[PDB]
Amino acid sequence: KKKVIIIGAGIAGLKAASTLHQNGIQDCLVLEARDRVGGRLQTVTGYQGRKYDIGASWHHDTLTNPLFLEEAQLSLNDGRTRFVFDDDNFIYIDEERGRVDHDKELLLEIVDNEMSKFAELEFHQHLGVSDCSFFQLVMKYLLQRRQFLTNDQIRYLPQLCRYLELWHGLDWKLLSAKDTYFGHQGRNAFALNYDSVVQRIAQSFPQNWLKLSCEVKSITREPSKNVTVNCEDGTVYNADYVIITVPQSVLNLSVQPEKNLRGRIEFQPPLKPVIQDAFDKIHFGALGKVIFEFEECCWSNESSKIVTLANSTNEFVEIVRNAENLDELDSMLERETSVTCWSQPLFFVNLSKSTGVASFMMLMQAPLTNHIESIREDKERLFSFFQPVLNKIMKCLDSEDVIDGMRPIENIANANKPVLRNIIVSNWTRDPYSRGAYSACFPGDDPVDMVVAMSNGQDSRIRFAGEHTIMDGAGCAYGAWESGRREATRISDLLKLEH
Amino acid sequence: SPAKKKVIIIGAGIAGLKAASTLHQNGIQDCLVLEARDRVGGRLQTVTGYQGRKYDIGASWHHDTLTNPLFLEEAQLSLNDGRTRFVFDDDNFIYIDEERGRVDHDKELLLEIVDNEMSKFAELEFHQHLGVSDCSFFQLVMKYLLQRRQFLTNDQIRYLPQLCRYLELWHGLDWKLLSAKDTYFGHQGRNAFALNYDSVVQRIAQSFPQNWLKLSCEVKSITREPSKNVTVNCEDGTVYNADYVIITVPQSVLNLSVQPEKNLRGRIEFQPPLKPVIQDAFDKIHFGALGKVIFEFEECCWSNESSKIVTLANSTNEFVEIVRNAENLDELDSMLERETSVTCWSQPLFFVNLSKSTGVASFMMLMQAPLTNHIESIREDKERLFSFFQPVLNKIMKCLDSEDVIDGMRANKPVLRNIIVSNWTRDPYSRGAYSACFPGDDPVDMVVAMSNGQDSRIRFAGEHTIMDGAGCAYGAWESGRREATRISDLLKLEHHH
Numbered sequence A: 001k002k003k004v005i006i007i008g009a010g011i012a013g014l015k016a017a018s019t020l021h022q023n024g025i026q027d028c029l030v031l032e033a034r035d036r037v038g039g040r041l042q043t044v045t046g047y048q049g050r051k052y053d054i055g056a057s058w059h060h061d062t063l064t065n066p067l068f069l070e071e072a073q074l075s076l077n078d079g080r081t082r083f084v085f086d087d088d089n090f091i092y093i094d095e096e097r098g099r100v101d102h103d104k105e106l107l108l109e110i111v112d113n114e115m116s117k118f119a120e121l122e123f124h125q126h127l128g129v130s131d132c133s134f135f136q137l138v139m140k141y142l143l144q145r146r147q148f149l150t151n152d153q154i155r156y157l158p159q160l161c162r163y164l165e166l167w168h169g170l171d172w173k174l175l176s177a178k179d180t181y182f183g184h185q186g187r188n189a190f191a192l193n194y195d196s197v198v199q200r201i202a203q204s205f206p207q208n209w210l211k212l213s214c215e216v217k218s219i220t221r222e223p224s225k226n227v228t229v230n231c232e233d234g235t236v237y238n239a240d241y242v243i244i245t246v247p248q249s250v251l252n253l254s255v256q257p258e259k260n261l262r263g264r265i266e267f268q269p270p271l272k273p274v275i276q277d278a279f280d281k282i283h284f285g286a287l288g289k290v291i292f293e294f295e296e297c298c299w300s301n302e303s304s305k306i307v308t309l310a311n312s313t314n315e316f317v318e319i320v321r322n323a324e325n326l327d328e329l330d331s332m333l334e335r336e337t338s339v340t341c342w343s344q345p346l347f348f349v350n351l352s353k354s355t356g357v358a359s360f361m362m363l364m365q366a367p368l369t370n371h372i373e374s375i376r377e378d379k380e381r382l383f384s385f386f387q388p389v390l391n392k393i394m395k396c397l398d399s400e401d402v403i404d405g406m407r408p409i410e411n412i413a414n415a416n417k418p419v420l421r422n423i424i425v426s427n428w429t430r431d432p433y434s435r436g437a438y439s440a441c442f443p444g445d446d447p448v449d450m451v452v453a454m455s456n457g458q459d460s461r462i463r464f465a466g467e468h469t470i471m472d473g474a475g476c477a478y479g480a481w482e483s484g485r486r487e488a489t490r491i492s493d494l495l496k497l498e499h
Numbered sequence B: 001s002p003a004k005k006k007v008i009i010i011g012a013g014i015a016g017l018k019a020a021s022t023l024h025q026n027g028i029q030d031c032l033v034l035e036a037r038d039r040v041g042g043r044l045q046t047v048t049g050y051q052g053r054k055y056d057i058g059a060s061w062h063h064d065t066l067t068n069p070l071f072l073e074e075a076q077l078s079l080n081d082g083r084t085r086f087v088f089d090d091d092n093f094i095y096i097d098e099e100r101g102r103v104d105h106d107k108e109l110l111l112e113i114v115d116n117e118m119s120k121f122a123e124l125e126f127h128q129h130l131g132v133s134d135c136s137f138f139q140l141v142m143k144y145l146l147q148r149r150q151f152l153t154n155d156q157i158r159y160l161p162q163l164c165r166y167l168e169l170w171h172g173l174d175w176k177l178l179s180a181k182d183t184y185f186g187h188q189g190r191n192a193f194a195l196n197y198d199s200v201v202q203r204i205a206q207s208f209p210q211n212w213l214k215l216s217c218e219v220k221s222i223t224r225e226p227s228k229n230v231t232v233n234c235e236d237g238t239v240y241n242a243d244y245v246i247i248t249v250p251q252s253v254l255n256l257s258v259q260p261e262k263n264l265r266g267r268i269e270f271q272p273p274l275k276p277v278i279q280d281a282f283d284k285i286h287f288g289a290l291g292k293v294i295f296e297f298e299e300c301c302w303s304n305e306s307s308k309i310v311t312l313a314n315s316t317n318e319f320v321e322i323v324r325n326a327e328n329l330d331e332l333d334s335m336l337e338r339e340t341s342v343t344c345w346s347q348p349l350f351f352v353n354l355s356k357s358t359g360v361a362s363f364m365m366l367m368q369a370p371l372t373n374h375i376e377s378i379r380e381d382k383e384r385l386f387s388f389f390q391p392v393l394n395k396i397m398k399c400l401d402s403e404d405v406i407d408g409m410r411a412n413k414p415v416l417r418n419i420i421v422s423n424w425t426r427d428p429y430s431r432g433a434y435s436a437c438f439p440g441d442d443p444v445d446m447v448v449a450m451s452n453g454q455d456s457r458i459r460f461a462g463e464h465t466i467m468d469g470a471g472c473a474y475g476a477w478e479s480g481r482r483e484a485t486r487i488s489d490l491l492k493l494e495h496h497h
C-alpha cells in the first residue's frame, strides 16, 4: 500500500523520508519505536532552561562533511547562528602536577604526535600484521623509544594520549590499535542545536508519514514482490521497499533466539550469512556524557577543551627503563581495586568560553560509562564521584572548590565560588533502542565488512542505512544522514523509471 | 700506465664516504675516493666561531628518527658508550609579528589549529589524485583562504598565511616559487639535532683504508672504454682506470655536464655524454637555496622558553578586505596586484635558540631563496648584515623579555660578538643547498635516471638519487650503500667455480 516504509526516525531515517518527498515519491511511512524522532540525536533541557546535546554534539570533518556544508549555506543566507567552531588548545590536568599541557620541558604534545606517526608506520602495508590493543601499542612505543624519552614523558605521555578513548568510547585495553588513529578532515563545529537539524529535516516531509511508538517486531520478504512489516502493537503494513535504519547493536539481536529482546526484528527469510558474519567483526562502543550546570562562570575561559589524566606512577617509569623486552614488560606491568574519577581520562567541554553557558559537558568511556549511567538517578553519589576532578579543574582555572547546591540554600558567602546546581547524565547503554553509543573496534575487528554487507542490502527491497552502513563519516551523524540519502535516491530513481 | 683500481668514488661527501665504507665492509680492495675540496664531508661542514663555539653550517638535524638508518646507528653507539651525539630539540614554536608581537598558542587567533586544517586541505587537494594540476604553495594557501573565509576570522585570514610559510625554510624556496604538490609531506618522528655532524663524517671516513682518500683532486672527465673499463682524469693530470665508478657530485654540479664549456669548476666531461634520460631529468627537478646565519652573543640574557622561533613577514588588513570581497579565484588573483625593497620583514625567518637546546648563547637562523642568495652575496660585510637583521633581532629580544642588541663585533643587554654566514650558493662545488621542486616538477624522474645509472659501470649516488630521504643526509648515505652493495654483488661472481 506504501511506496517506501522507513524504519527508525533518527537522522538516517528522517533524511531518507525527506529525500523521497523531495523527489516526488508519496505514500511513504516512518515507523519509530520511541515517542520522539531524532534517535541518537537528542537535545535535553536542564537548569534555567539551558539546552544540551546529550547525544551527538559536533559536526566533524567540516572540510568535507556535507551536512555541515548544508547548515553553512543556510547560515550564510539568513545570517543565523547554527554552530560555532570550538576547537581549542587542550588543557591537560594531572591530579598531582596540575596542568601539563604546552609545557616547556614535558612537551607531551610533541611526543604524542610521534606516537601517532609510530602507529601509522606499525600497520602500514601489511594487512595489520597481527593486531593488538591500543594499550599494547603505546607500550611497544615506550619500549622502542625509551632511549629518546625523559622520565616524565614516559610517565605522562601514555595517560595524555588516552584522550582517544573519548573518540572511540572504549578503554585503551579494549580498543583495537589498528583503528585507534584516524585523520580528521578539518576542524570540528559544535552544533548549536542538533535538534534544530532534526526539526528542519523532520518538517521536510508530510507529517502523517510519521508513526511514533511503532516497535517493529518482524520484517518478511513477501514471496510476491512487496514487503510486510508488523509493529508490536499489532498494526501491519506493506510497501514496495523498506529502509531499516535501526542501530547495528539492535539489528544484531536478529541473529539470536527468542524475538523476546526489546527492539529485535524478526527477519523472514533470515539475514544472509554475509550479514551475520559481519557482526563477528565486533562493533558498538559506549561513549557517555555527564553535564555539570553551575550558577555562573567564575573561572578562567582560557580554553573550551580540558582533559584530566588518569593517575600515573614513577614506578611505571622504572619498570619501562628496566624491562629487557616486551614479554618481560607485560609480566612486570602485571601489578595486582575500586574505580574513581582518576581511574581513566575524562574529557570536559567548558561551555562558557564557546557558548556563554556556565556548564561543563563531560565525555566518558566503557567501562565507566555503564557504571555512571547505572547510577544516573543518584545525584548525591554522582557528585561525590566527580567532585575531586571537578575541584582540580577549578583550581587549575583560577577558582576554588565546587559548592554543592543541587539542593540549593541561597548563601551570600558563595560570591566568587562555583556553585553546582544540577547534574545530567546520558542513558544510551541502558536504552534498548540504542544499546550503546556507536560502532567501535575491539582488537581484531574489520569495520569494512559491515559497510559492504549493509550497503549491499538484504535484497532488492530490503535496504539498510545508518552510521554503521557507510565508509565516509562512519559512526558519524553526517555518515548516517548521507546513508539515508543514499537509499532514498536509489529507490527514488527506480520508482521514477518504472514508468 | 694509469693505476688500475676496482672502484673509484668521486666526491667525499656522505654518499661517497658511505660507499667506500661499504665496499671495504664487503672486502673489496684497491678502491679510491677523489674529492675536489681539501676536506671531506661536503654539505656536512662544522665551522668554528666566537671562542671556539662550533656550528654545522650545512646539515644540522637527523630527520625522521623513527626510521632514519643513519640516526639509528648513531643512537646504538651512544647507547653503548654513553657519549652524547645528538639532542632532540623539537619544541613549541614562538611566532612573532612586528606590530603585534607573539601570536603563538593564542587563545583567540588559534593559528596553529587552522594551520593544521590548511595542511589537511592541501592533503585532500592532492594525494591519491590523478591528473591534478600543481600550483605554487602560495596559490594553494590563497585557495584555502577564499574557500574557508566563512569560517575564519579577520585576524586569522591575515596572519595564518604568514605563519604557514615556515615551510619555506624546509625547502629553501619562497612560497611563490614552491611546488604545492611537494610543500607538505610526512615526517617519520621527531628531529635530533646533531652535536657535531662532522662527528658522523669522521667515523665513516675512518671505517675504510685511509690511503684510499685523495683530497684536492678535482675530476675533469670520465670515459667508458668500450673494452669494459672507466678512465678518470684528475685536474692535476693523474689518470686512473677502474672497473666501476660511483659519481656523487651535487645535482647542480652534474648538471654542468650537459652544457658546453669544460672550464667550469666541478664540471665533468662525460664520454660518451650522459644519456638523454639523465640530461632531460634536469628539466623536471631543481635546486633550492636553504641558507644559514649564526648570531653569536656574549651570553644569554633572554628567555629560554623555547628553542624554536619564527618571525612572520609583515601582513596587511587590506589583504583581508580583498579576501572578503573576492568573487572567485580569478577575482582574487587579479585584485592582488600592487604598485619597495627587501628587508628582514619581507619573508619568514626561522631562528634556533641554541641557548636552551645546547647551552650556547647563539642563534642559528635559516633563510630561503631569494633572500639566501642576496645574503650570501654580502656575507663579508658584517656591519651591513647586522643592520639588515637588527630589527628582527630586537623584536625577538623584546618578546623574550630582553632589550635591543648591542653591536659588540669589534649588564643585562644582549651583545652581538660575531656573525657567521653560509656560502653554498657561491661554492662552485655546491652551487646551492639541495634538490627542490618548482611547480610542475617531477623528482621521480631524476631519481629513476640516477638510480639506473649511465651504464653498468658508471653509477650515481647523492641526495638527489633516491626517494626515501630525498634531499636528506640519510638519503645520501643510503644511496651510497646502495651502489657499493650492487658492486659487491657483481664482484661476488668472481669467486664462483
Ligand SMILES: Cc1cc2nc3c(=O)[nH]c(=O)nc-3n(C[C@H](O)[C@H](O)[C@H](O)COP(=O)(O)OP(=O)(O)OC[C@H]3O[C@@H](n4cnc5c(N)ncnc54)[C@H](O)[C@@H]3O)c2cc1C
Binding pocket: A007, A008, A009, A010, A011, A012, A013, A031, A032, A033, A034, A037, A038, A039, A040, A041, A054, A055, A056, A057, A058, A059, A060, A214, A215, A216, A217, A245, A246, A247, A250, A262, A263, A264, A265, A287, A288, A289, A426, A428, A433, A434, A436, A437, A438, A465, A466, A467, A468, A475, A476, A477, A478, A480, A481
Ligand atoms: C553520546 C554520543 C555522542 C555522539 N556525538 C557525535 C558527534 O559529536 N558527532 C557525530 O557526528 N556523531 C556523534 N555521535 C554519533 C551519531 O549520533 C550517530 O552516528 C547517528 O545519530 C546515528 O544515526 P541513525 O540515524 O543511524 O540512528 P538513530 O539512533 O541514531 O537510530 C535509528 C532509529 O531506530 C529506532 N529503532 C530501533 N529499534 C527499532 C525497532 N525495533 N522498531 C522501530 N524503530 C526502532 C531508534 O529508536 C532510532 O530512532 C554520538 C553518539 C553518541 C551515543
Ligand SMILES: Cc1cc2nc3c(=O)[nH]c(=O)nc-3n(C[C@H](O)[C@H](O)[C@H](O)COP(=O)(O)OP(=O)(O)OC[C@H]3O[C@@H](n4cnc5c(N)ncnc54)[C@H](O)[C@@H]3O)c2cc1C
Binding pocket: B010, B011, B012, B013, B014, B015, B016, B034, B035, B036, B037, B040, B041, B042, B043, B044, B057, B058, B059, B060, B061, B062, B063, B217, B218, B219, B220, B248, B249, B250, B253, B265, B266, B267, B268, B290, B291, B292, B422, B424, B429, B430, B432, B433, B434, B461, B462, B463, B464, B471, B472, B473, B474, B476
Ligand atoms: C644549508 C643546508 C642545511 C641542511 N640541513 C640539513 C638537515 O638539517 N638535515 C638533513 O638531513 N640534511 C640537511 N641538508 C642536506 C644534506 O646536507 C645533504 O643531503 C647531503 O649532505 C648531500 O650529501 P652528498 O654526499 O650527496 O653530497 P655532498 O655535497 O653533499 O657532495 C659530494 C662531494 O662531491 C664533491 N665534488 C663535487 N664536484 C666534484 C668534482 N668535480 N671532483 C671531485 N669532487 C667533487 C664535493 O666537494 C662534495 O664533497 C642541508 C643542506 C644545506 C645546504
